[PDB]
Every structure is written in structure tokens, then in C-alpha cells.
Amino acid sequence: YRLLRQALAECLGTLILVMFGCGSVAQVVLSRGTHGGFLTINLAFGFAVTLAILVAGQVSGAHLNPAVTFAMCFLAREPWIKLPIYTLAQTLGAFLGAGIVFGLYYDAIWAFAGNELVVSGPNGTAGIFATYPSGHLDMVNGFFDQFIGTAALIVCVLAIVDPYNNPVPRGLEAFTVGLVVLVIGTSMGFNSGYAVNPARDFGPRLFTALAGWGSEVFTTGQNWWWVPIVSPLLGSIGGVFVYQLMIGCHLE
Amino acid sequence: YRLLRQALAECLGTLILVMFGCGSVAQVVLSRGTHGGFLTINLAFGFAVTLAILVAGQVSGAHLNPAVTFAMCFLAREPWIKLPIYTLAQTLGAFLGAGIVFGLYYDAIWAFAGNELVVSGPNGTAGIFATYPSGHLDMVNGFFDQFIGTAALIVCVLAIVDPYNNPVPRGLEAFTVGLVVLVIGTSMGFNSGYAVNPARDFGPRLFTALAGWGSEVFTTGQNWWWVPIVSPLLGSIGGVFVYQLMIGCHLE
Amino acid sequence: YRLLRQALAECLGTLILVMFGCGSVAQVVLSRGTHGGFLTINLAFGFAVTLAILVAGQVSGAHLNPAVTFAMCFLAREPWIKLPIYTLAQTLGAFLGAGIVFGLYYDAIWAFAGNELVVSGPNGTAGIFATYPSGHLDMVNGFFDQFIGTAALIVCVLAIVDPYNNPVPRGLEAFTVGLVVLVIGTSMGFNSGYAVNPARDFGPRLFTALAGWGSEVFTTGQNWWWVPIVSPLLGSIGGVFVYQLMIGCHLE
Amino acid sequence: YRLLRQALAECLGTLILVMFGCGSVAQVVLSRGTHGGFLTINLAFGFAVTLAILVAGQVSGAHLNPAVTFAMCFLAREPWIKLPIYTLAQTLGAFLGAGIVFGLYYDAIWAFAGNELVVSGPNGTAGIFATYPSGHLDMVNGFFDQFIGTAALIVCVLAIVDPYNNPVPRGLEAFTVGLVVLVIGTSMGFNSGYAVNPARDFGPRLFTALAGWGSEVFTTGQNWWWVPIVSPLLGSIGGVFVYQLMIGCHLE
């Protein structure tokens, strides 16, 4: 089965992304103002995209993003059967990637707030794995940034993928996509890294629910958990229309 | 119409540059000493050039700069009819790019100085979109830096564009130009990023005039608004002569 | 003898890595909070891998890591006779690389704690050359990070090396491996850089034993010296199985 | 005359390097702890090498270093007549590059210490253009770092230049050399950037002598001015022998 082979590559690619990305977030959160700031988080997350794509690029195409996979299926470049397989493979591996980071920082995470696991607050460790609303980043405000961020990512991704343009040699597509991830985190109001990936958000968040943080990871922030899933899905559609209207429909 | 197709690519490319660039400036200005310093602003602006060129490079040549377009027209490498079309397309998209950043940070920008929009001062938000004079960066002083910065950018750009040299494969021209933008911001006295682009300056500045900042964005700094337009236009001419005299005229 | 030629390249490559890497660590440790933080250490160590690979890549394959060499021998891609030759060549050159750094900072190192050489503590200089346990990085905790870090490095390295994939042009393999080293240091809990290299650890540590620090460099931290040797050796085996099971065994 | 054409390219390349490099140093020195630290200085200097090489690479080979030119002449790869022409062309352009930086920061430099030009001290501006000894960086100590730094640069440069290896495509040689410059500044004890270039040191230093700083720029630091000239010249010879003995003499 060729589909199973691509799913395994997607799972390994997302495992590298989450483990390498959330590990840098853990160092910054646990070591308050000691191991750098948000620049290291975005640089590590951005460079993790390049490494993950270089590993699983030749096998599954290195989507590593349900929004990216949805965009290709919308453009009829991939079968619709790949959408559930890739999303399940991308979610399974972000769940596994968060487990490795939890094991690496098991002693430090439990000692952040004494001997208890707190979801949100000054002594909050659940923000290492999943994104949570800020003071000015409420549900209405946070929906717009994810829509814009995903649309920008889709437009840049489709530029290096369209067959009408000259083929891009291997070793530059990975860096280009990784450059977008680093730039998006720096620009948009999200200090967690790759906040436009539905698999990178729901995966680790589901792990924290069973790891000991409880069900409060889903019922906090006025039920914020579904926003980083629906919003990038709609942003990918908008990004496809923006690119097609400006560049895609005229490449004869 | 082929010209219309190139104009759309230029508008999209400048939209990516301004939205990704001014978004990082907004985070630094609004979060005073929290989301990094000037290194993040220059890195985000420099990497935004690479992404914008990689998107619109194959369609319009990825000028994204009225000074760069003027240099090509001066060297007779492009028709003079492209100068008004590209400048209008580059300005329209910097205006649109600033609107996206304004929408992203609408709540934070309005709360910077209470419930009012101030152009200049310690509680100033108009500096996110457009450049304003500093204490040692007056009209006479600020004219020289933009002249030198644009001349350096033109010389570097013409090195990778001249047909006499070996053709540069796609995926390295974008990074080379982006490297110049990051270096120029670090070297010259401008903490806003890409301060040598007439479209990146007048575009967002015009948006702030209608967004609510008033007409003071044009009548402040002893009428500074026209400097980041005239000065890079003259610097591009000087950069063309410097490159042609040293390298261009001898490439037989 | 072809084997002797490859050993000389490995010694020179590891000499460049340790001298360029440990030199940045010396500046940060000696200049407490003056010459940057851990970002510079990881960037210098990561970029040193790229330079070392670009130098000795065409002669010996640019392993520069006993764990990497062990992985190739395990996969039957290299003869088992190369394992002792490369390990000796990699250790000899990390010993020499630490000597250059010691000579460069001879006056500053001796004046860190007055006129004495201290192994561990606030006035500790032995941490420039070798890794030492932290408060939350004990022998049991530190074993797991090195196992995970080496496994991640092996998986990424094998992706660009497998002959079934398209050959990678020279000039991108060096940067890809250097990217992994920078990312691993940022993610895992190690503020020394390239903490998954057995030669980079035992080599400089052996130098400090004879340089004047005494035998305490081996008997401190509950005999921590053998951990950065055994743990990456086991992690390389795990990384080989992870890559082969997911990608390697299906590349037909 | 072909030799005159190469000299003009070398002058322009060194002009880009010094103006882009010393401009970042001026911002850090004048804005005490405001425009970043030593990371920006090394990043700007390192990236300036890449831009300068990409401009003058196809015309003169992009040496931009008297030590590098001396190494090629020693290896009989270039005629000995090129040594005085390139050194004069490299020095003329570092003198011109420092003049542009002086004009850019004329008001800020003169106001650093009131209304006077001081060579050394807390209110010292002569360190922007030329290197000066530190507390632990005396003449004997500073000689060794420049010898080691130049030898490391020569070894890395010769790796990508030797014809026996596979030719390096344009667009990667510039980045490789620029990577060495950034790494050397971070590793060795020099917070000025590219402290192993005789032209980058004597050129701007000579400008300060006539700009108003007086002859004290040559008679300070126990006559330190000749060290950054003799030491890299000897280091280039040592770097050539190190590379030839290990790799060069065995490439059959």
C-alpha cells in the first residue's frame, strides 16, 4: 500500500517538528528569561520545518500541515482520500512529539508550580504544548490572525509547488517553507511558533488532557481549542483564492 | 494584456513584504522591550524580501521597489512604460499591506496612548507604518543615509542581474536581495526596516492619513514625507553609475 | 594508504569544530553576560559543523561524530575497520582543538577564580570544554536527553545520505547537518553546544585532566564522564531503527 | 589592461565590506546598549563578505583580503605581480568605505565625547574603524589570536577553491566564506568583526589619522597598528601548510 508509506513519513515529519519546536518553547517557559526569548522559539520552529521536510519530502511530499493538505485537495492536485489519512498521520506524531518533550522536561515541568500541573496563569506549563489566548488575543481577535497567517503560508507554499513554474531543486523548497514559518511567528501575535498548524495545536493539546493537566485544557479560554483548527482551514481556502486570482489563473 | 499580469504580481509581492515586515515592527513598538529589538525587525524585513521575490519572481521579475524599477528603466533594460505601472502596483499593496497589519493590531494600537491615535512621541503608533525623523536624523541628515542605502542596494542588485555574468539559478537571487535589505537596515541609521523603498514608505503613510491619524503624518518632521521618495530615486541613479563605471562597462 | 588519508581529514574537521565551537563557549563563560547568551553558542557550534563538513567532506565523508560513524557501520554502509580509525582521528583533534582554545584564553581562564583552576562551581572554567550535570540534569536525567538528541541527529543525517533518494549536491549537505546541531542544542537541555558528540566531549575533557584541572574532571558529577559516550552510542542504534522502520525499509 | 579591471572590482568589493561592516559597529558603539550587541556586528560583517564576493567574484575572484591574496601567490596559483595591485586596491576602498561611514555618523561621532575626537577610552570613537587592544588583549596576546584566526580562514577558503575538488557553483562560495568570518568573530576575542583582514584594519585606521583623530591612532597601545598586518600575513602561511599537509598534498 503506497498510501500507508506516505502516512508513516508524515507521522515522522510531524514528530520531528513538534519535538524540536516544543522543546525550545519548554526551555524558554521553564527558564524564565534565561534561555533566550521569542527569537529562539521562532528560529527553532522555523528550522524544524526545514529538517522535517528534508526527511519526508521524497516519500509523502512533506505537507506536515492539515491546512496545506486541504489546499492541495481543494486545487484537485491530490485525491480527497489523502485528507483523512494525512490528518490522522499528522496528528499522530504531534501527540507523540509532545510525549518526548514531556519526558525530557518531566522534573522541571512538575516543579514549575510546586508539585501540581496548572493549565493557565503565571505558573502555567500547558502553554508549552498548545496555544492559549492572551489579554488582547481573545476568540474574536485570535480568529483573524490565524486566518491571515494561514492564507499567507498557503500563498507562499503554492508559489514553489505550481508545476507551471520551473521545478525547484531539492534543498531549497524546505528552506523556503521554513522561512515562512519563522516570519509568520515573528509578524503575527503568537509567541508559541507555528500557530497556523492544526496538527501542531490539537495534537499536543490532546496529550496534555491525558498527561495530567485534566480536561481544563479544552474548556478554558471560552472554549478556545477549536479556533486553531477551524480558522486555518478557512484561511487555506482564502489563500488559495488569493494566489489563484493574482498568479495562478494567468500562468499559461 | 501581459503588463496587467506583471502588475498583479508586483502588488501581491509588495503586499507580502509590507504585511510581514510592518507586522514585526508593530510587535516591537507595541510591546515595549518584550518581543525583541531591532534585530528581529531587520531579520523579518530581510526574509520578507526573499519570500516576496520567490512568489512574484517568475511573473514580473520581482522588483518590489520603485528605485529598482527606475534603475532598470535608466539602463534601458526595461521599457519606460513599466515605470508608472509598477510604481502604482507597488504602492497599491503597501497600502493594502498596512491595512492588514492595522486590522491585526487594531485593539493594541488604539490602546497605546489611551483611546487616541498619536503620530509622534513616546506614545506614537504612526512609526510602525512609516519612517519618521529622529533626533540626529533630520531632513538634511536623513537625506544622505537614504541616498547611500539605495545606491548600495542598486549595486548589489545589478550584480546578480547583468546578463554578461553567468545566470543565477532560482532560489539564490531572492536570498541575495534579502541579504542586502537586512544588512542595510543594520548598517544605516534606520530602525524601521527597508527604509530605502519608496513604495514601502509612501504607501503605508498614506493609509495612516485616512485610518485616523489625520493629515499630521504629512506635515510633521518639517515635511519629511517627500524625502524617502526623492532620495532613493537619486540614489538609484548614483548606484547605477557606480556599478557601471567599476564593473558594468568592462564586462566584455 | 587510503585509510590514513581519511583519518587526517577527520582529525582536521574535528579540530575546526571544537576550536570554533568551544571558543564561543569560552567567551560567554568568561565574559559573564557580556558576549551574548546561548544563542551565540548554538549558532557558532551549528555553523562550525557546516564549515568542518565542507572541508573534509570530499576526503573522508565528513562524519566528525563517533555515533554517526557507528550508525554507518551498523547499516553495513562502511567497513567495521573504519570505526576505530575514525574514532581515534575524531578524538585526536578535539584534544588538539581544546588546546588552541586554552592557549587563546590562557590569561582569562586562569584569572576567572583568582590564580587557580576550578572544575565546577560559580567560578568554573572546566565547563567550557566538557559538559557537566546541572541541577535538573543528573545522570539519570542526562542519559535520556543524549539518547533522544543522538537519535534525532541520526534520523536527519540518514535522510540526506541514503542512495535511494536523489543525490544531494555539495553545499547543502553541510548546511543540513549544521542545522540539526543548532536545533538540537536549542531544543534539548544542554547549553554547551553539540552535546551529542562523543569525540567533542571526551576529547576536550581529557585535555583538561592534563592541562591542570586534575583528575576531578572524571570523578565529579557521580562519574558523569562516561555518560556522553555510552548514551549517544545507544541513541544512534535507536535512530537507525526509527528511520529504517518508517522510511528506510520502504524505499524501493 | 586586465589587471586594472580586477583592481577596480577589488576596490568596490572592499568598499562594500567596510561600509556595511563598520556601519553596524558605529551603531553599537554610538548607541550604547541600544542597537544590539556583538551578534549584530558579526552577522553584519559576515553577511557583508557574501555580498562583496557576489559582486566582484566574477571579475577579480573576490579576494578582499591581503592575507588571502598572499596565500594564493604562495601556492603559485596567482602571479606575484597581483599582490601589490590587489593590496593597494583592497586598502583603497577600505579608506573610502570608512569615509562613507564617517559621513553617515558625522553628527553622532562628534557628540560622543562632547565636541572632541578621542581615540581610546570610555568615550572612544576610533574603535569603530580600527581594532584596539583590550585589557587581556595586549600585543603578545593579540598576536596569537590573529595568527590562529587567519590560519583558520585560509584553511576554509582553500577547501572550496582547490581545483582537484568538484567545482563549487556560484552562490555558495560567497556564503561559505561569509560563514567563516561570522564564526571567527564569535569565537576569537575580537568584538569588531573581520579582525583578520589587513586591509580592513590599516585602511580605516589611516582614515582616522587624517579625519581629525590625529597621529595617536598609530602610537597608542604600544604601537599596536602593525600587529593586524604582520600577524595575518604569518597566519596565512601557517594555514596553507596546515591544509596542504592534511588534505592538499593527498588529493590525487
User: If we measure between CA atoms, which residue out of D177, D178, D152 comes closest to residue D236?
Assistant: D152
Task: Report yes or no on chains C and B touching (3+ CB pairs under 8 A).
Answer: no
Residues 6 or more apart whose CB falls under 8 angstroms from that of B105 comprise A189, B26, B30
For chain B, give me the number of helices (H) and strands (E)? Answer: 10, 0
Closest chain B C-alpha to A18 CA, distance in angstroms: 22
The region that residue D134 occupies, defined by phi over 0 for left and psi between -120 and 50 for alpha, beta otherwise, is beta
Cell of B23: 507586522
User: If we measure between CA atoms, which residue out of D156, D153, D149, D193 comes closest to residue D44?
Assistant: D193
Size (chain C), residues: 252
Residues 6 or more apart whose CB falls under 8 angstroms from that of A229 comprise A198, A201, A202
Which stretch of DSSP H or E encloses residue A39?
helix A38-60
Cell of B72: 532598470
Cβ contacts of A148 on chain B, cutoff 8 Å: 19, 100, 104
Cell of A219: 474548556
Query: 3-state SS string over chain C?
Result: CHHHHHHHHHHHHHHHHHHHHHHHHHHHHHCCCCCCCHHHHHHHHHHHHHHHHHHHHHHHCCCCCHHHHHHHHHCCCCCCCHHHHHHHHHHHHHHHHHHHHHHHCHHHHHCCCCCCCCCCCCCCCHHHCCCCCCCCCCHHHHHHHHHHHHHHHHHHHHHCCCCCCCCCCCCCHHHHHHHHHHHHHHHCCCCCCCCCCHHHHHHHHHHHHHHHHCCHHHHCCCCCCCHHHHHHHHHHHHHHHHHHHHCHHHCC
DSSP D126-152: GGGTS----SS--HHHHHHHHHHHHHH
Within an 8 Å CB–CB cutoff, is residue B155 touching chain A? no
For chain C, state the CA radius of gyration.
18
Interface test with C, best of D43, D143, D157, D187 (most C CBs within 10 A): D187
CA distance A114 to B175: 47
D175 CB-side CA count, 13 A: 17
Residues 6 or more apart whose CB falls under 8 angstroms from that of D124 comprise D113, D118, D132
Contact call for residues A221 and A133 (beta carbons, < 8 A): yes
Contact call for residues A126 and A45 (beta carbons, < 8 A): no
CA distance D53 to D14: 9
Write phi, then psi, for A163 (nearest 5 degrees): -65, -20
The packing angle between helices C2-30 and D173-187, to 10°, is 50
Q: Cell 530605502 sits at which residue?
A: B196
For chain B, state the CA radius of gyration.
18
One-letter amino acid for residue B190 of the chain:
F
CA distance A161 to A173: 9
CA distance A186 to B200: 19
Contact call for residues C74 and C236 (beta carbons, < 8 A): yes
| DSSP 8-state secondary structure symbol assigned to residue B250 | G
User: If we measure between CA atoms, which residue out of B89, B80, B82, B81 comes closest to residue B52?
Assistant: B89
One-letter amino acid for residue B159 of the chain:
A
Q: In terms of C-beta distances under 8 Å and separation of at least 24 residues, what long-range contacts does C31-35 make, across chains too?
A: C35/D37, C35/D38, C35/D191
Closest chain B C-alpha to A252 CA, distance in angstroms: 11
Contact call for residues C103 and C109 (beta carbons, < 8 A): no
Task: Report yes or no on chains D and A touching (3+ CB pairs under 8 A).
Answer: no
- The 3-state DSSP composition of chain B as helix, strand, coil percent (nearest 5) reads 70, 0, 30
Other C-beta atoms closer than 10 Å to the C-beta of B215 total 10
Q: Is D94 exposed, middle or buried (0-12, 13-18, 19+ CB in 10 A)?
A: buried
Within an 8 Å CB–CB cutoff, is residue C43 touching chain A? no
User: If we measure between CA atoms, which residue out of B24, B63, B28 comes closest to residue B44?
Assistant: B24
Distance of CA C232 to the CA centre of its chain: 10
DSSP D74-124: HTTSS-TTHHHHHHHHHHHHHHHHHHHHHHHTHHHHHTTTSSS--SSSTT-
User: If we measure between CA atoms, which residue out of D137, D98, D122 comes closest to residue D16?
Assistant: D98
Contact call for residues B74 and B236 (beta carbons, < 8 A): yes
One-letter amino acid for residue D23 of the chain:
G
Domain D2-250 has CATH 1.20.1080.10: yes
Of D51, D56, D169, the CB nearest to B183: D51
Domain residue ranges in chain D? 2-250
CA distance B16 to C140: 48
| DSSP 8-state secondary structure symbol assigned to residue D167 | P
Closest chain B C-alpha to A246 CA, distance in angstroms: 6
Q: Is D106 exposed, middle or buried (0-12, 13-18, 19+ CB in 10 A)?
A: middle
Please report the resolution in angstroms.
Answer: 2.9
Q: Cell 577589488 sits at which residue?
A: D10
**CA distances to A59, A176, D49, D81 from D180, in Å:** 35, 23, 10, 27
CA distance A106 to C149: 16
For chain D, state the CA radius of gyration.
18
Residues 6 or more apart whose CB falls under 8 angstroms from that of B129 comprise B22, B98, B101, B102, B204, B205, B207, B208
Solved by what technique?
cryo-EM
Cell of A163: 508545476
User: If we measure between CA atoms, which residue out of D201, D204, D47 comes closest to residue B187?
Assistant: D47
| DSSP 8-state secondary structure symbol assigned to residue A127 | G
| DSSP 8-state secondary structure symbol assigned to residue B167 | P
Does A104 contact C165 at a Cβ distance shorter than 8 Å? Answer: no
Residues 6 or more apart whose CB falls under 8 angstroms from that of B95 comprise B203, B204, B206, B207
Contact call for residues B105 and B98 (beta carbons, < 8 A): no
Cβ contacts of C170 on chain D, cutoff 8 Å: 166, 168
Hey, CA dihedral for D120, D122, D126, D131, is it positive or negative?
Answer: positive
Cell of C10: 577527520
